[PDB]
Amino acid sequence: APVTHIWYFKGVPSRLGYLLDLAPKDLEKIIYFAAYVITSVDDEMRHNELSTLEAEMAVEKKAVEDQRDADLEARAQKLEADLAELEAEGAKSDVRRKVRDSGEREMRQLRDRAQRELDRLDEIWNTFTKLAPKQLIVDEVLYRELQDRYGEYFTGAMGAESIKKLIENFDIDAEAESLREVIRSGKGQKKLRALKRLKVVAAFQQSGNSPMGMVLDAVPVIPPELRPMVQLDGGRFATSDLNDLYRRVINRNNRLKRLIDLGAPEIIVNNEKRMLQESVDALFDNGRRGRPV
Amino acid sequence: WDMLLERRSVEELEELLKERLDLIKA
Amino acid sequence: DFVWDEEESEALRQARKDAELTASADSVRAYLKQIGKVALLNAEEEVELAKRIEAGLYATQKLAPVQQRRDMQWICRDGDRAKNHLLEANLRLVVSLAKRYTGRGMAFLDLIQEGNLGLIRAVEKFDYTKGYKFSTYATWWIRQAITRAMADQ
Amino acid sequence: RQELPSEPIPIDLSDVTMRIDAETAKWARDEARKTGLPHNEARAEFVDVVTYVVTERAVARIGRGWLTRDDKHAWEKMRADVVGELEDHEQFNAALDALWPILTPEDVLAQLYTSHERLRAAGAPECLWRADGEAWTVSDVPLLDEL
């Protein structure tokens, strides 16, 4: 699994964060398997399909309205039937009022459910109509439901894979030109941001050295004799304590590989990926995210 | 895949598949 | 709930001095948040979902515009769905069993994942006709995988 | 200024939907008063007690099924994680600023003179109300110093 080099993510100014324009908090949520970020989307055809998608939402909303009508008719009719079978008796006003109370509270619950469904459908429409690359979506339910069908129009993922993908598509020259234009065609106090970010961005434009190095597809291992271990009498062992981190990284990688061999559920795979990334990050640095094992 | 054939006869697996197909068609 | 003492002050005292910096190796909060979308099964599903897993496992091998073809196209996907759902349902047990050997140098997440691989064995290496409650068999295989991992240390 | 909110304040934590209420805020400010230290010094006790309760509740909520009362190294470990996260949570710090803020003598006097509700509650006569709260007279100097 890809892993973002710790030096460039954590520790402000986050150079990866400055390059991507994403805030360090959202970048943390993305790297460490807590949120989904979108990537290349369909724009060649979906524009003609927007009307049909809206029509789908509208027809399902009309169906929701009919189902709401039936559900509330249930309460109304049962209230009327209870009052028909009760009020025929010379009963006290409590017999009349209890039915009203119960039926109307069920009425309120059903109405709440119907309105919530309508709002959820509106949210689906609104999130689709704005969906674009490098956008953030948090809820797993909404992201997965959008994928299952409408993802024929968009692709997305989480973890270091998403950052790798969106830096593959990063337009270094165009971003640098836009920042230069902003600082040149800019007079406000906010301009300093575009002034600072250029420093991080143009660093890769000026002499190359693509920012693909921000993410690692292979990690070097230092020569063994620089990290010795000393066995002792009495069953004690003295360690340089970095060999343990290397062992952990190797364990994480091997377990991840043998986990993906059988096609385990994607959530366990995500957990293992986060674990491997954290192990390699601890191998690289400690005390920044926190104290190590 | 091997453990499914080894643990139970292929006839049982075929019967289970037919039952699932029927419960989907019912 | 609403109690304050010196002895109760200590419990926040030590945590406050030590745990300002996150030791992520045991930070299980994300994974537990992810599992929480679960509710326990019953015996009926305990049988039906295993049967679905077997049917899909047969279909995916046998497959290598009519209702005969549509049925198997359905079953092949449904069995994998069943496997995933059963594993996701049983994750909590893996967590609760991984707790049992924490603190002896092993990070909790390692035990979680070893038990999860044992469970991934358990989901398919199983027959509903045996009648045993699936959670007990899952506990057996989770503990077996965890101690197999603990054979390496 | 030992205020407790009229409505619960959502913690808005990353994973758990924890919230603070006038009950726990009342208990915390009660304990801080019981300590008897000055305002900015009893802030430590107030924040510590609030953190204790919120962490207990949050760990109980996260510890569902897999964890009930594993006091040794499992319950306490989750308490440690929750406190480590909460002490840096922006919303928690904002809430603890709204409740029991750090005050200077000017912050006290200006608001006290302007509100006209604080004067009534504190027993101060309305002979000394003014909209220009931070306009000091020679009479306010000793009060500002005693604050």
PDB file of all heavy atoms in Angstrom, chain A residues 160-182:
ATOM      1  N   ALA A 160      -3.452   6.856   1.459  1.00  0.00           N
ATOM      2  CA  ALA A 160      -2.387   7.411   0.635  1.00  0.00           C
ATOM      3  C   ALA A 160      -2.627   7.166  -0.847  1.00  0.00           C
ATOM      4  O   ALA A 160      -2.056   7.876  -1.683  1.00  0.00           O
ATOM      5  CB  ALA A 160      -1.039   6.821   1.049  1.00  0.00           C
ATOM      6  N   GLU A 161      -3.452   6.175  -1.193  1.00  0.00           N
ATOM      7  CA  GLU A 161      -3.754   5.915  -2.596  1.00  0.00           C
ATOM      8  C   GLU A 161      -4.425   7.118  -3.248  1.00  0.00           C
ATOM      9  O   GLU A 161      -4.093   7.486  -4.379  1.00  0.00           O
ATOM     10  CB  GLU A 161      -4.643   4.677  -2.715  1.00  0.00           C
ATOM     11  CG  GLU A 161      -4.953   4.264  -4.143  1.00  0.00           C
ATOM     12  CD  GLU A 161      -5.841   3.038  -4.210  1.00  0.00           C
ATOM     13  OE1 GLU A 161      -5.950   2.326  -3.189  1.00  0.00           O
ATOM     14  OE2 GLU A 161      -6.433   2.786  -5.282  1.00  0.00           O
ATOM     15  N   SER A 162      -5.379   7.739  -2.551  1.00  0.00           N
ATOM     16  CA  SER A 162      -6.073   8.891  -3.116  1.00  0.00           C
ATOM     17  C   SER A 162      -5.124  10.065  -3.322  1.00  0.00           C
ATOM     18  O   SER A 162      -5.193  10.756  -4.346  1.00  0.00           O
ATOM     19  CB  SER A 162      -7.231   9.297  -2.207  1.00  0.00           C
ATOM     20  OG  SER A 162      -6.755   9.795  -0.969  1.00  0.00           O
ATOM     21  N   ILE A 163      -4.238  10.314  -2.356  1.00  0.00           N
ATOM     22  CA  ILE A 163      -3.261  11.390  -2.502  1.00  0.00           C
ATOM     23  C   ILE A 163      -2.321  11.102  -3.664  1.00  0.00           C
ATOM     24  O   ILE A 163      -2.004  11.997  -4.456  1.00  0.00           O
ATOM     25  CB  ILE A 163      -2.498  11.598  -1.182  1.00  0.00           C
ATOM     26  CG1 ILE A 163      -3.475  12.024  -0.086  1.00  0.00           C
ATOM     27  CG2 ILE A 163      -1.399  12.638  -1.351  1.00  0.00           C
ATOM     28  CD1 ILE A 163      -3.812  10.934   0.884  1.00  0.00           C
ATOM     29  N   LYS A 164      -1.857   9.856  -3.785  1.00  0.00           N
ATOM     30  CA  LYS A 164      -1.024   9.484  -4.924  1.00  0.00           C
ATOM     31  C   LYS A 164      -1.753   9.751  -6.236  1.00  0.00           C
ATOM     32  O   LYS A 164      -1.184  10.318  -7.176  1.00  0.00           O
ATOM     33  CB  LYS A 164      -0.628   8.011  -4.820  1.00  0.00           C
ATOM     34  CG  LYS A 164       0.125   7.477  -6.031  1.00  0.00           C
ATOM     35  CD  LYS A 164       0.646   6.064  -5.782  1.00  0.00           C
ATOM     36  CE  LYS A 164       1.946   5.764  -6.528  1.00  0.00           C
ATOM     37  NZ  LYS A 164       2.945   6.866  -6.479  1.00  0.00           N
ATOM     38  N   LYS A 165      -3.023   9.352  -6.309  1.00  0.00           N
ATOM     39  CA  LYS A 165      -3.791   9.528  -7.535  1.00  0.00           C
ATOM     40  C   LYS A 165      -3.939  11.006  -7.878  1.00  0.00           C
ATOM     41  O   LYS A 165      -3.755  11.410  -9.031  1.00  0.00           O
ATOM     42  CB  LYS A 165      -5.165   8.869  -7.379  1.00  0.00           C
ATOM     43  CG  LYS A 165      -6.101   8.975  -8.587  1.00  0.00           C
ATOM     44  CD  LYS A 165      -5.391   8.875  -9.938  1.00  0.00           C
ATOM     45  CE  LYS A 165      -4.604   7.576 -10.088  1.00  0.00           C
ATOM     46  NZ  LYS A 165      -3.623   7.654 -11.204  1.00  0.00           N
ATOM     47  N   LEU A 166      -4.257  11.832  -6.881  1.00  0.00           N
ATOM     48  CA  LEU A 166      -4.505  13.242  -7.149  1.00  0.00           C
ATOM     49  C   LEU A 166      -3.225  14.052  -7.317  1.00  0.00           C
ATOM     50  O   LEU A 166      -3.293  15.177  -7.824  1.00  0.00           O
ATOM     51  CB  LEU A 166      -5.376  13.844  -6.041  1.00  0.00           C
ATOM     52  CG  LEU A 166      -4.764  14.065  -4.656  1.00  0.00           C
ATOM     53  CD1 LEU A 166      -3.994  15.374  -4.583  1.00  0.00           C
ATOM     54  CD2 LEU A 166      -5.854  14.022  -3.594  1.00  0.00           C
ATOM     55  N   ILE A 167      -2.067  13.523  -6.912  1.00  0.00           N
ATOM     56  CA  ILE A 167      -0.806  14.163  -7.277  1.00  0.00           C
ATOM     57  C   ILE A 167      -0.308  13.672  -8.630  1.00  0.00           C
ATOM     58  O   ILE A 167       0.492  14.366  -9.275  1.00  0.00           O
ATOM     59  CB  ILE A 167       0.295  13.952  -6.219  1.00  0.00           C
ATOM     60  CG1 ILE A 167       0.634  12.468  -6.057  1.00  0.00           C
ATOM     61  CG2 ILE A 167      -0.125  14.569  -4.895  1.00  0.00           C
ATOM     62  CD1 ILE A 167       1.861  12.218  -5.207  1.00  0.00           C
ATOM     63  N   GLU A 168      -0.752  12.496  -9.076  1.00  0.00           N
ATOM     64  CA  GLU A 168      -0.494  12.090 -10.452  1.00  0.00           C
ATOM     65  C   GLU A 168      -1.187  13.029 -11.431  1.00  0.00           C
ATOM     66  O   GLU A 168      -0.621  13.381 -12.472  1.00  0.00           O
ATOM     67  CB  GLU A 168      -0.954  10.646 -10.665  1.00  0.00           C
ATOM     68  CG  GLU A 168      -1.077  10.212 -12.125  1.00  0.00           C
ATOM     69  CD  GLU A 168       0.239  10.272 -12.879  1.00  0.00           C
ATOM     70  OE1 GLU A 168       1.251  10.713 -12.297  1.00  0.00           O
ATOM     71  OE2 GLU A 168       0.259   9.873 -14.063  1.00  0.00           O
ATOM     72  N   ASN A 169      -2.409  13.446 -11.110  1.00  0.00           N
ATOM     73  CA  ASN A 169      -3.169  14.372 -11.937  1.00  0.00           C
ATOM     74  C   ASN A 169      -2.869  15.832 -11.620  1.00  0.00           C
ATOM     75  O   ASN A 169      -3.438  16.718 -12.265  1.00  0.00           O
ATOM     76  CB  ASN A 169      -4.669  14.114 -11.766  1.00  0.00           C
ATOM     77  CG  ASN A 169      -5.099  12.773 -12.327  1.00  0.00           C
ATOM     78  OD1 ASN A 169      -5.455  11.860 -11.582  1.00  0.00           O
ATOM     79  ND2 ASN A 169      -5.074  12.651 -13.649  1.00  0.00           N
ATOM     80  N   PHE A 170      -1.999  16.102 -10.648  1.00  0.00           N
ATOM     81  CA  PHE A 170      -1.695  17.479 -10.281  1.00  0.00           C
ATOM     82  C   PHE A 170      -1.060  18.219 -11.448  1.00  0.00           C
ATOM     83  O   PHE A 170      -0.167  17.700 -12.124  1.00  0.00           O
ATOM     84  CB  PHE A 170      -0.766  17.512  -9.070  1.00  0.00           C
ATOM     85  CG  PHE A 170      -0.835  18.790  -8.287  1.00  0.00           C
ATOM     86  CD1 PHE A 170      -1.859  19.009  -7.382  1.00  0.00           C
ATOM     87  CD2 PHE A 170       0.131  19.768  -8.450  1.00  0.00           C
ATOM     88  CE1 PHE A 170      -1.924  20.184  -6.660  1.00  0.00           C
ATOM     89  CE2 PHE A 170       0.073  20.944  -7.728  1.00  0.00           C
ATOM     90  CZ  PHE A 170      -0.957  21.152  -6.833  1.00  0.00           C
ATOM     91  N   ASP A 171      -1.527  19.443 -11.676  1.00  0.00           N
ATOM     92  CA  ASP A 171      -1.051  20.294 -12.764  1.00  0.00           C
ATOM     93  C   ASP A 171      -0.065  21.297 -12.172  1.00  0.00           C
ATOM     94  O   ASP A 171      -0.421  22.428 -11.840  1.00  0.00           O
ATOM     95  CB  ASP A 171      -2.228  20.978 -13.450  1.00  0.00           C
ATOM     96  CG  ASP A 171      -3.158  21.669 -12.464  1.00  0.00           C
ATOM     97  OD1 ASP A 171      -3.354  21.126 -11.357  1.00  0.00           O
ATOM     98  OD2 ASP A 171      -3.703  22.741 -12.796  1.00  0.00           O
ATOM     99  N   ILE A 172       1.194  20.872 -12.047  1.00  0.00           N
ATOM    100  CA  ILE A 172       2.197  21.700 -11.380  1.00  0.00           C
ATOM    101  C   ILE A 172       2.355  23.034 -12.104  1.00  0.00           C
ATOM    102  O   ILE A 172       2.313  24.104 -11.485  1.00  0.00           O
ATOM    103  CB  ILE A 172       3.535  20.943 -11.277  1.00  0.00           C
ATOM    104  CG1 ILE A 172       4.527  21.706 -10.394  1.00  0.00           C
ATOM    105  CG2 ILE A 172       4.137  20.693 -12.654  1.00  0.00           C
ATOM    106  CD1 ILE A 172       4.139  21.760  -8.935  1.00  0.00           C
ATOM    107  N   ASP A 173       2.529  22.990 -13.426  1.00  0.00           N
ATOM    108  CA  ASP A 173       2.742  24.221 -14.178  1.00  0.00           C
ATOM    109  C   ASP A 173       1.515  25.124 -14.125  1.00  0.00           C
ATOM    110  O   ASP A 173       1.640  26.339 -13.934  1.00  0.00           O
ATOM    111  CB  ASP A 173       3.111  23.893 -15.626  1.00  0.00           C
ATOM    112  CG  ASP A 173       2.028  23.111 -16.347  1.00  0.00           C
ATOM    113  OD1 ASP A 173       1.005  22.776 -15.712  1.00  0.00           O
ATOM    114  OD2 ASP A 173       2.200  22.830 -17.551  1.00  0.00           O
ATOM    115  N   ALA A 174       0.322  24.549 -14.285  1.00  0.00           N
ATOM    116  CA  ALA A 174      -0.891  25.358 -14.250  1.00  0.00           C
ATOM    117  C   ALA A 174      -1.133  25.938 -12.862  1.00  0.00           C
ATOM    118  O   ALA A 174      -1.546  27.095 -12.734  1.00  0.00           O
ATOM    119  CB  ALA A 174      -2.088  24.524 -14.701  1.00  0.00           C
ATOM    120  N   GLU A 175      -0.890  25.150 -11.811  1.00  0.00           N
ATOM    121  CA  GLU A 175      -1.028  25.677 -10.456  1.00  0.00           C
ATOM    122  C   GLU A 175      -0.054  26.821 -10.209  1.00  0.00           C
ATOM    123  O   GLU A 175      -0.421  27.846  -9.620  1.00  0.00           O
ATOM    124  CB  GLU A 175      -0.811  24.561  -9.434  1.00  0.00           C
ATOM    125  CG  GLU A 175      -1.817  23.424  -9.523  1.00  0.00           C
ATOM    126  CD  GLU A 175      -3.004  23.624  -8.604  1.00  0.00           C
ATOM    127  OE1 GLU A 175      -3.552  24.746  -8.571  1.00  0.00           O
ATOM    128  OE2 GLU A 175      -3.387  22.659  -7.909  1.00  0.00           O
ATOM    129  N   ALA A 176       1.197  26.665 -10.651  1.00  0.00           N
ATOM    130  CA  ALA A 176       2.170  27.739 -10.489  1.00  0.00           C
ATOM    131  C   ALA A 176       1.741  28.988 -11.248  1.00  0.00           C
ATOM    132  O   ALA A 176       1.852  30.106 -10.732  1.00  0.00           O
ATOM    133  CB  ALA A 176       3.547  27.273 -10.959  1.00  0.00           C
ATOM    134  N   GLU A 177       1.248  28.817 -12.477  1.00  0.00           N
ATOM    135  CA  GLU A 177       0.797  29.966 -13.254  1.00  0.00           C
ATOM    136  C   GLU A 177      -0.380  30.656 -12.579  1.00  0.00           C
ATOM    137  O   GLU A 177      -0.449  31.889 -12.543  1.00  0.00           O
ATOM    138  CB  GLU A 177       0.422  29.527 -14.670  1.00  0.00           C
ATOM    139  CG  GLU A 177       0.104  30.674 -15.620  1.00  0.00           C
ATOM    140  CD  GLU A 177       1.343  31.428 -16.070  1.00  0.00           C
ATOM    141  OE1 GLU A 177       2.397  31.293 -15.415  1.00  0.00           O
ATOM    142  OE2 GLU A 177       1.262  32.155 -17.083  1.00  0.00           O
ATOM    143  N   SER A 178      -1.321  29.876 -12.042  1.00  0.00           N
ATOM    144  CA  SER A 178      -2.469  30.467 -11.363  1.00  0.00           C
ATOM    145  C   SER A 178      -2.036  31.236 -10.122  1.00  0.00           C
ATOM    146  O   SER A 178      -2.536  32.334  -9.857  1.00  0.00           O
ATOM    147  CB  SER A 178      -3.479  29.379 -10.995  1.00  0.00           C
ATOM    148  OG  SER A 178      -2.954  28.508 -10.009  1.00  0.00           O
ATOM    149  N   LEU A 179      -1.105  30.675  -9.345  1.00  0.00           N
ATOM    150  CA  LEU A 179      -0.617  31.379  -8.162  1.00  0.00           C
ATOM    151  C   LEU A 179       0.108  32.662  -8.547  1.00  0.00           C
ATOM    152  O   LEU A 179      -0.057  33.702  -7.892  1.00  0.00           O
ATOM    153  CB  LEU A 179       0.302  30.464  -7.352  1.00  0.00           C
ATOM    154  CG  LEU A 179      -0.407  29.383  -6.535  1.00  0.00           C
ATOM    155  CD1 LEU A 179       0.571  28.293  -6.126  1.00  0.00           C
ATOM    156  CD2 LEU A 179      -1.078  29.987  -5.312  1.00  0.00           C
ATOM    157  N   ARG A 180       0.923  32.610  -9.603  1.00  0.00           N
ATOM    158  CA  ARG A 180       1.608  33.810 -10.068  1.00  0.00           C
ATOM    159  C   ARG A 180       0.605  34.871 -10.502  1.00  0.00           C
ATOM    160  O   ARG A 180       0.759  36.054 -10.178  1.00  0.00           O
ATOM    161  CB  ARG A 180       2.553  33.458 -11.218  1.00  0.00           C
ATOM    162  CG  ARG A 180       3.274  34.654 -11.822  1.00  0.00           C
ATOM    163  CD  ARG A 180       4.245  34.224 -12.907  1.00  0.00           C
ATOM    164  NE  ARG A 180       4.553  35.312 -13.828  1.00  0.00           N
ATOM    165  CZ  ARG A 180       3.795  35.662 -14.859  1.00  0.00           C
ATOM    166  NH1 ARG A 180       2.658  35.039 -15.126  1.00  0.00           N
ATOM    167  NH2 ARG A 180       4.186  36.663 -15.642  1.00  0.00           N
ATOM    168  N   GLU A 181      -0.435  34.463 -11.231  1.00  0.00           N
ATOM    169  CA  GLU A 181      -1.462  35.405 -11.658  1.00  0.00           C
ATOM    170  C   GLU A 181      -2.188  36.006 -10.460  1.00  0.00           C
ATOM    171  O   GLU A 181      -2.504  37.201 -10.450  1.00  0.00           O
ATOM    172  CB  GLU A 181      -2.448  34.701 -12.590  1.00  0.00           C
ATOM    173  CG  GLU A 181      -3.448  35.621 -13.266  1.00  0.00           C
ATOM    174  CD  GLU A 181      -4.340  34.882 -14.243  1.00  0.00           C
ATOM    175  OE1 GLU A 181      -5.354  34.301 -13.803  1.00  0.00           O
ATOM    176  OE2 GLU A 181      -4.025  34.878 -15.452  1.00  0.00           O
ATOM    177  N   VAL A 182      -2.467  35.188  -9.444  1.00  0.00           N
ATOM    178  CA  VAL A 182      -3.165  35.681  -8.258  1.00  0.00           C
ATOM    179  C   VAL A 182      -2.319  36.725  -7.542  1.00  0.00           C
ATOM    180  O   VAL A 182      -2.801  37.809  -7.194  1.00  0.00           O
ATOM    181  CB  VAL A 182      -3.526  34.512  -7.324  1.00  0.00           C
ATOM    182  CG1 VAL A 182      -3.807  35.017  -5.915  1.00  0.00           C
ATOM    183  CG2 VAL A 182      -4.721  33.747  -7.870  1.00  0.00           C
TER     184      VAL A 182
END
